[PDB]
């Protein structure tokens, strides 16, 4: 019946609620537990870290940063190096999302270095994935014709992801491999290594199927299609977007489905088919407005007016722009 005992109890309920996917409730329990307090700084460290992650998942990145900062500091106070490595990785990930890449890199690098010192291979691998992510976001945030420092950041990302894959292969960690393959493929895409991107997304697709992860499967098909566009193989691309459209309906994901239809219309145009294009753009706007999607609504129109203006229908084209200008002004 100490203060220590109630803090623990509140925290356990916090952890339970968060695992169940109710982060909003869990946050309050962790805040209650902080309110009650405890003299065990190890317990308190774990509560801060869970608050940081809970806020991160709720997209309150500014709060996530605050709590991961407290956790890092407290980890240093008590000399818990494993705890320090974890907090720094968490901090770097939050910094990355906020667009503070320079400090993000320093924090994620501290997570890697300490994992190495401790001979913690699981942690080392996670830190490498985190580092690939930061260098990727860093290179992508700028603005084939890239400044040297941008190409260098993207190529470091490739190296981190490949180093990660080598360790998680040794560890037998399939979900970790799925994550790395996907982001590696995206990094190759940005570098214009389109063949390598396909290879990476193919591996990512295979793992998505293994897990029965229909959403990851859907991402992979979509990324594969994008890469085939830039390889010229427009036919194969439409075939992958068709796969995503099928999946979009199974998942009952309205927006994703809008995306799938929009892409196919754009691909047929590169194939010089304008009817199919129109039918897909039609579905997109139909689903767009259905989601309170103003930006999307207009996009379809400029597309549609270009497609009718290619068909030879110079009236329905010249029409289409009119509803676009309306949403434009709105």
């Amino acid at each position: 019946g100490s203060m220590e005992a109630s803090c623990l109890e509140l925290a356990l309920e916090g952890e339970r609620l968060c695992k169940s996917g109710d982060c909003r409730a869990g946050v309050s329990f962790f805040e209650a537990a902080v309110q009650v307090g405890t003299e065990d700084l190890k317990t308190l460290s774990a509560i801060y870290s869970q608050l940081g992650n809970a806020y991160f998942y709720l997209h309150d990145y500014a709060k996530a940063l605050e709590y991961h900062h407290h956790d890092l500091t407290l980890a240093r106070t008590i000399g818990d190096q494993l705890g320090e490595a974890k907090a720094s990785g968490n901090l770097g990930n939050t910094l990355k999302v906020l667009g503070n890449f320079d400090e993000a890199i320093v924090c994620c690098q501290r997570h890697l270095d300490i994992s190495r010192e401790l001979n913690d291979k699981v942690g080392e691998a996670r830190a490498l994935y985190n580092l690939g992510n930061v260098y990727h976001a860093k290179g992508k945030s700028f603005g084939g014709e890239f400044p040297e420092e941008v190409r260098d950041a993207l190529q470091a990302a490739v190296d981190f992801y490949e180093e990660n894959l080598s360790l998680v292969t040794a560890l037998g960690d399939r979900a970790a491999q799925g994550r790395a393959f996907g982001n590696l493929g995206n990094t190759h895409y940005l570098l214009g290594n389109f063949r390598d991107a396909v290879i990476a997304h193919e591996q990512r697709l295979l793992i998505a199927k293994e897990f029965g992860d229909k959403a990851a499967e859907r991402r992979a098909y979509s990324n594969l299609g994008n890469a085939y566009i830039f390889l010229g193989e427009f036919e194969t691309a439409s075939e992958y977007y068709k796969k995503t459209l099928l999946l979009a309906r199974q998942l009952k994901d309205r927006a994703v489905e809008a995306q799938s239809c929009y892409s196919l219309g754009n691909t047929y145009t590169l194939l010089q088919d304008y009817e199919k294009a129109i039918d897909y753009h039609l579905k997109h706007l139909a689903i767009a407005q259905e989601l309170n999607d103003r930006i999307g609504e207009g996009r379809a129109c400029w597309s549609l007016g270009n497609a009718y203006t290619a068909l030879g229908n110079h009236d329905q084209a010249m029409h289409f722009a009119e509803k676009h200008l309306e949403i434009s002004r709105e």
């Binding site: 190890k42 509560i47 869970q50 956790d71 942690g123 996670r126 940005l190 990512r204």
Partner: peptide, 18 residues
């Protein structure tokens, strides 16, 4: 847009070490 995989985060629990 290319669609990214999720970030991982490192986790701690109060049940660690007892």
């Amino acid at each position: 847009h290319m669609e990214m995989e999720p970030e991982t985060m490192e986790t701690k629990s109060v049940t660690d070490y007892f």
